[PDB]
Amino acid sequence: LALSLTADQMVSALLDAEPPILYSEYDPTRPFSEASMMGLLTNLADRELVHMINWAKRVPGFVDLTLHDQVHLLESAWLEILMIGLVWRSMEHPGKLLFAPNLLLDRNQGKSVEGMVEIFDMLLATSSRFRMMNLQGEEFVCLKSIILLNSGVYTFLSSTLKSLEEKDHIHRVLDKITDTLIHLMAKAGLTLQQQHQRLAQLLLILSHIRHMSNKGMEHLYSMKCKNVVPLSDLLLEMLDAHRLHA
Amino acid sequence: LALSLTADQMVSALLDAEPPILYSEYDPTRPFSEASMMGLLTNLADRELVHMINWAKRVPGFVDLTLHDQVHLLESAWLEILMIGLVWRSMEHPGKLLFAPNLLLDRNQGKSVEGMVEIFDMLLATSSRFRMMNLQGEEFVCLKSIILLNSGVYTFLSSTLKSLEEKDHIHRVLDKITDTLIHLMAKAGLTLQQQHQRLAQLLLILSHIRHMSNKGMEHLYSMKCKNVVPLSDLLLEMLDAHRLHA
Ligand SMILES: CC/C(=C(/c1ccc(OCCNCCCC(=O)N(C)C)cc1)c1ccc2[nH]ncc2c1)c1ccccc1
Ligand SMILES: CC/C(=C(/c1ccc(OCCNCCCC(=O)N(C)C)cc1)c1ccc2[nH]ncc2c1)c1ccccc1
């Protein structure tokens, strides 16, 4: 079980779970101002979501939950998870966002759609902050799993007994990831005082990732994408897998 | 200076800084369905904001900042600060929100304005979570000061030298409040492992306070309050105080 893993085993499992880095799908032989920036980002997000599902299934503790709860967690967290990935990719690219290895965009390119450049600047400031802190890959995968488990855990509909059991388990997994972060920091030599300070600096950036997700979601809902299968159904379909290909 | 305070001195200073608990201003001899719920909450928020300014000036480190930066921090954080106060007041009132000692409202009373009951439920879930964790008053005042200092620190416009110095100072104050939280938890007997776990559980709730603030702000902007002095000017006026009454 998730709750019996050691720190190194948690880290190994999170590292192995990482999704691939995907490419934007545009014709690189054709001009750039043809392309719709929102169309490129939308297509990229849709492909990435399928992989995110595979990733979340490999995060220790996640497939112990109900499919209803798995859907709820991913529905709450998907844009934060995309965003923390984006910021992490972009750390060593000051002033730009690496949406994909063929789609590295600066501030100005942000202006194409009224909205983004606000978000674009928030994302660059976050990447900058991670660069300052010298965020490690092992710390990053802990933080991204924390988002997955934490973002939706305060908005479950019910206090059924099953729901109380599900919340307790989520909170126990989160405690194991905190232990794992502390173990990483100790292993790299920081003092106890530096350990707690760094833990707090990393978790406080998660508040800013939430903010950015909310600002982006505000824009996405305003696009008004007239009757399509709701996100929970699509999540349910990808999550509600059969086992015929095992 | 803020940076030279001990933990006990930080806690004492935060406890002494606490604003008063204000009452809603309605005629308690007259019927309830006369009153506009949004009008009551709006009036309450406006009075509370003046006191919040006084409070923020007493948070160690805050008046070392530029008035521009003080405005920016409060402009980002004011609704989170109101909300964490609300949740704290409501902990020992299961199923209700204590907006004021004469304005304790349940879920159903939330429904008066299309919007709130969504937010209302998030706020009740947060109060419940604090009740579960058995949040202390000393921990609460640390968390509320963290919101004040953290919420806006990733969205400063500039990297002027003065701005870099201001960010470094904010980050040093935040590190002192983390040390203070850890000292509280140690003083109350928790193990080192429990210390870090509790630190993470408290800071992750701040992500949910951000979310709720954003959902509320979405509603407030949609009200479309046609040309009034912008919030930054009003903040500037209360913050940009003379010293003639010293
Ligand atoms: C930060 C940039 C950004 C991104 C973004 C994300 C999602 C977007 O689309 C929402 C989905 N609508 C389609 C619904 C139909 C459907 O699902 N089907 C038919 C299967 C669009 C953009 C985006 C896209 C890809 C990314 N990789 N990493 C990060 C990242 C981010 C963005 C977000 C909000 C506003 C503006 C821009
Ligand atoms: C959670 C409930 C909630 C609250 C709320 C907060 C602020 C509100 O008004 C915004 C200000 N507009 C006036 C602008 C003009 C001006 O400033 N001048 C002329 C000086 C309204 C409500 C509220 C009010 C008082 C509170 N105590 N503690 C918490 C708390 C919260 C709420 C927030 C958003 C949507 C729905 C409800």
Angle between helices A137-150 and B192-222 in degrees, nearest 10:
60
| CB burial string A181-211: b at 16+ within 10 A, e below | bbbbbeeeeeeeeebbbbbbbbbbbbbbbbb
Of ligand 2's listed atoms, the one at least distance from the Cα of B79 is 6
Q: What angle do CA B235, B238, B239 make, to 5 degrees?
A: 80
Q: What residue owns the CA closest to ligand 1's atom 26?
A: A45
Count Cβ atoms below 10 Å from residue A157 Cβ, excluding itself: 9
- Which amino acid, one-letter code, is at B76? S
How far from chain centre, in Å, is Cα A191?
Answer: 29
Distance from Cα A37 to the centre of ligand 1, integer Å: 11
Long-range CB pairs of A81-85 (<8 Å, 24+ gap) are A81/A52, A81/A144, A81/A147, A81/A148, A82/A45, A82/A48, A82/A52, A83/A123, A83/A126, A83/A209, A83/A212, A83/A213, A83/A216, A84/A140, A84/A143, A84/A144, A84/A147, A84/A209, A85/A144
A154/B206 touch (CB, cutoff 8 Å), yes or no: no
Between strands A96-100 and A103-106, the pairing is: antiparallel
Mutation site, B3, B72, B154, B198, interface A, largest A CB count within 10 A: B154
Q: Residues in chain B whose beta carbon is closer than 8 A to a beta carbon of chain A?
A: 121-122, 125-126, 129, 146, 150-151, 154-155, 171, 174-175, 178-179, 182, 192-193, 195-197, 199-201, 203-211, 214-215, 218
From B23, B42, B140, the mutation candidate for ligand 2 (largest count of ligand atoms within 8 A of CB) is B42
The length of chain B is 246
Could you give the CA distance from residue A118 to residue A34 in angstroms, rounded to a whole number? Answer: 23
Q: Are the beta carbons of B104 and B23 closer than 8 angstroms?
A: no
* Chain B residues close to A214, C-beta within 8 Å: 210-211, 214-215
A/B interface, count of CB pairs below 8 Å: 94
Distance from Cα A100 to the centre of ligand 1, integer Å: 13
Angle between helices B137-150 and A192-222 in degrees, nearest 10:
60
Could you give the CA distance from residue B192 to residue B185 in angstroms, rounded to a whole number? Answer: 9
What technique was this entry resolved by? X-ray
- The CATH superfamily assigned to A1-246 is Retinoid X Receptor (1.10.565.10)
Ligand 2 pocket, residue B80 CB under 6 Å: no
Task: Give chain A's largest Cα–Cα span.
Answer: 58
Ligand 2 pocket, residue B99 CB under 6 Å: yes
Distance from Cα A114 to the centre of ligand 1, integer Å: 15
Resolution (A): 1.7
* CA-based nearest residue to A130, from A202, A43, A47: A202
Between strands B96-100 and A96-100, the pairing is: unpaired
**Token pair of B186, please?**
């140690």
Ligand 1 pocket, residue A119 CB under 6 Å: yes
Could you identify the residue written with the tokens 């908005």? Answer: A155
Question: What residues contact A234, with CB distance under 8 A and at least 6 apart?
Answer: none
Measure CB to CB from residue B150 to each of A192, A204, A215 and give the nearest one.
Answer: A204
Q: Which helix (H) or strand (E) holds B97?
A: strand B96-100
Q: Residues of A comprising the binding site for 17beta-estradiol?
A: 48, 89, 219
The length of chain A is 246
Q: For chain B, which residues make up each domain, given as ranges?
A: 1-246
**Token pair of B153, please?**
């620190």
HSE on the CB side for B203, CA within 13 Å?
Answer: 34
For CA atoms B25, B28, B31, B32, give the dihedral sign.
positive
Q: Which helix (H) or strand (E) holds B100?
A: strand B96-100
